[PDB]
Symmetry: C8
Subunit: 176 residues, 8 copies
């Protein structure tokens, strides 16, 4: 009897929502804290999200001896996407401090990654800047380790990123 079709639909429907409420609860997020000990003032340009979003303003100014705090997180709902993108600040020397972060949904296939680079001139973050920092500029793993690196322009980085979905990226930018 078609009585069994109605229950099939019922079970089928309870499966569906269990699965959607599950994927809904997977959280991927990133706290970013960058310490400006560069000797110059940074002014915010933008954050290009390749994946996910943010709920806050990107701090506009950041003086010598101050820290910038920003964060983001994957899109709400049962999507299987993470939080991935690039933060671009212009510096008072005319150049751009850029910072990559990647906190993926599917840890089977992907890992956490980060990067820091100083591009020449004012460059807003975008799909190209992300592709460069992610695929072609020796990005660091979110491997629970500290990594130092010279940036040019009389500057060096030193940064840490943990390996979980509740990611934090701490970076210090000092005079090399």
């Amino acid at each position: 009897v078609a009585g069994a079709v109605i229950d099939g639909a019922g079970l089928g429907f309870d499966v569906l929502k269990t699965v959607l409420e599950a994927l809904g609860n997977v959280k991927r997020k990133i706290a970013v804290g960058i310490d400006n000990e560069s000797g110059k003032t940074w002014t915010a340009m933008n954050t290009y999200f390749r994946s996910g979003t943010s709920d806050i303003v990107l701090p506009h100014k950041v003086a010598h001896g101050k820290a910038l705090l920003y964060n983001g997180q994957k899109n709400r709902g049962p999507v299987a996407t993470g939080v991935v993108g690039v933060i671009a600040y212009s510096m008072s020397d005319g150049n751009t401090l850029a910072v990559l972060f990647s906190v993926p949904y599917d840890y089977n296939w992907y890992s956490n990654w980060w990067n820091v680079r100083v591009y020449k001139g004012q460059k807003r973050a975008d799909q190209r800047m992300y592709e460069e920092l992610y695929y072609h500029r020796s990005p660091f793993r979110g491997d629970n380790g500290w990594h130092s690196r010279g940036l040019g322009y009389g500057l060096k980085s030193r940064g840490f990123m943990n390996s979980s979905g509740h990611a934090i990226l701490e970076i210090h930018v000092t005079k090399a």
Copy 2:
């Protein structure tokens, strides 16, 4: 037997409310903060909502060196509408400061957008003003970036809007 119609209705009813309680939980909202460093006093006229509503008063006065805070949100219930509209303030020079915001329900088809314009004279916001600022005056994306722009009348804007359903729009209006 019509026994299976009664269960079909039952399942059909539980589907319905699951879907309505879902759409009921989608939140779209906007916090707006505008900093008046324009040298003149602004007096509120109104907010035209193309979509959604607000639960608070639109601050009547805003002096030099003060900030205006307003907000809104989509209509209550299981509608698939967002929060979209224009805020109009009259300025003590005889002109209108207008500000667009768009925070749509369906991010598949739409994005966050904002705009700032200075119209000549007292102009209340309405469907026409919205259509202009949205479709025909190079509105900025809610792209997690800062965007500067001269307004005429010895004034410039500089504003930020994030990309999510929990939108904020921060704008500073300064003497160009």
Copy 3:
């Protein structure tokens, strides 16, 4: 078998209460704040509710330079009624300050409205005073806009009312 009648009744009963608990949760309410800068003292008369009720006392006195706060809300339970009515204050010049508010249940068919008028003499609010202010005296929409209006008797109004079910009506009464 009459087994299906028992379930029909069951489903039919669960429909009913879902719908009644829903209509039960729809809230319509109004916060009213009127600022007396009229130069005279107001003394309360009454509030005629065309729809809904209040849970508090209508403030008896309101001096020069003070504000009156009152509120109301629709009737409890699964009724489809709103909150609608008129507040009447006598003023020390012998006349009545009257104030309309309308926050309807069914926004398909209706909108928020308000009005402010100065009637000559002591006039308690009632169905007639409401019908006048609502249908025949150019009432303002709850349209998220400020609206000024001279009242006669050396007085002007300037008021705001938002467009939602969680309505507020802010009105300032100053010496014209």
Copy 4:
């Protein structure tokens, strides 16, 4: 099969308790505040409840320039009764201040009402005193309005009562 009788009973039983838990949640109550500016001391006699009860002591003394606070509420459980009765205070001039309140269960058939009277001598409240103040002495409606009235004995009343099930009755008793 008598299987359908067992479910009929089941549904029938779930109907019953839904209805009883509903009527159980209807609250009818009254907060009473009377301000003694009569020049004399009041001493409490009693409160005759025609309907409902109270959970507190009726304040025994109330001097010149002090206020009395009392309250009550309908009977607990799924009864369809309200809170209705008369409060009697003896006054130091030898007479009784009496105060009626009525907050009914079924607002289809009834409204809120109140009254204030000064009876000669010591008179405890009771069914007769209630019937007088309710049916035969021009009681005021709980109509969200202020109502003044001379009491004799060099005294006047001025009182307010809202229209809802969460009733309050505020009364001031001053020298006439």
Copy 5:
């Protein structure tokens, strides 16, 4: 099929516990506060509960100008009994102050009652003392009224008891 007996038992069992959890929630209790302004010191003897119990110690001493606080409540569980009994204090003049309270379960058949008497000598409370004070010594109703009464021995009472299941009994004992 005996399948319907198993469901009959099931329904029958859910009826039972609904009813037992209901009767379990009926609370009957009594707070007692007696003010000793008798000029003598009272020393506690005991409380005879005709119905119900207490969870606290009966205060042993109570000086001139102090108050005694005690309370009780009906027996835990789905019994249909109330809280009813007599409190006996010996007084420093050699006599006993006795106090009745009755807060019944079934308000259809019974009411709240109280009494105060001064017996000659040391008399512990018991079934006889209760029967006297309840049936044969003009006990006062828990009628939301104050009642004064001379006690002999240069003493008078003046006491109040409300009419609900959440009873309080306030009594003042002063020098007549």
Copy 6:
């Protein structure tokens, strides 16, 4: 069909746990407070529980002019046992202060009881000491009354115990 055995088991199982969760919630406990005004120091020996247990240490010392606080409660789980036993303290005169308490599970068949005795020498509490104090030494009822009694050895008791399952036993031991 054995289908009805599976449901019989099911119902039978839901009966069982309802009954076990009920008996699990019955609490029987005792707070004990003994005031040492005996002129000597008491040192704890032990508590023999005939029924139930404790979760705390039996205070080791108790000087002149100090009070001892101990408590216990029935065994965890759906047992139908109470909390019943004897507390033995050695006193600095070479003798034992012993104290009985009984707070039974089944108030149909049993009541609360207590006792105080002074035994000669060091005697730990045990089944015999309990049997003596319970069955053969005129123990006091937990009857919501104070009871005085000479103990010998220049000492008297005066103690109170309420009648409920949430028992407290307050005893004062003073120089006769």
Copy 7:
């Protein structure tokens, strides 16, 4: 029909988890507090758990006139094991203070026990030391009694352990 096998499995599965969630909730734990008034400093070696575990560090030092606090508890999950073991501290005289505790799961078959011994030299606790203190060295019962005992080496113990699953063991070690 195999329909009854599916329900048999269902019931069978609900039995299983009810029983596993039950055994999961049985808690067995032990708080240990030992007061060092031995004249020497103790240094921790280890705790051998015959059954269960701990979640904290075993305090390393414990001076003259200080107390050591440690605790443990049975293993998480639906096991039927308790918390049982031996604590070994080295003392500044070259010897070991050892302390047994046993808080079993199944009180049908077992009781609480404790012991205190001073072994010559540094001896870590282990299965042998436990077997000695438990089976062969006259261990004290967790019987809600104080028990004194000379330890040799110019030292005596005096300890208490209650009889419940929420065990505490208080021991004082003083100069004999």
Copy 8:
């Protein structure tokens, strides 16, 4: 009838999620606290997790006389993995302080373990360093005992680790 397949699936599905929510609740974690009394400054390199992750930054600096606090935990979700890995700090003498921890999921097959070693030069932790410290360098058990060990380079360790899934590892590093 295929009705029994639909229920089989249903039961089968409820089994599955009960089991997944269970494994989801098993927590394995580690708090690590290391006290630097080595006379030199440590600088963090990294933490290699063989199993699990962390949610925090590995403290970068740790001076003489200060303590480092870090922690981690197994991966979120119904995996049967623990938290296992090695922490590597460079020391101001040019060498690496390394610290192993192992807190496994399946206590049937595995135990808690820890280790401390001083490697020559800067060596980041990794799979090899873990395999050495775990399999080949006499690691200590998480056995609720203190264990001392000379490290070379004028340094010794002394550390404690408990035996449970809520592991802590406390280690002191002092001058040898």
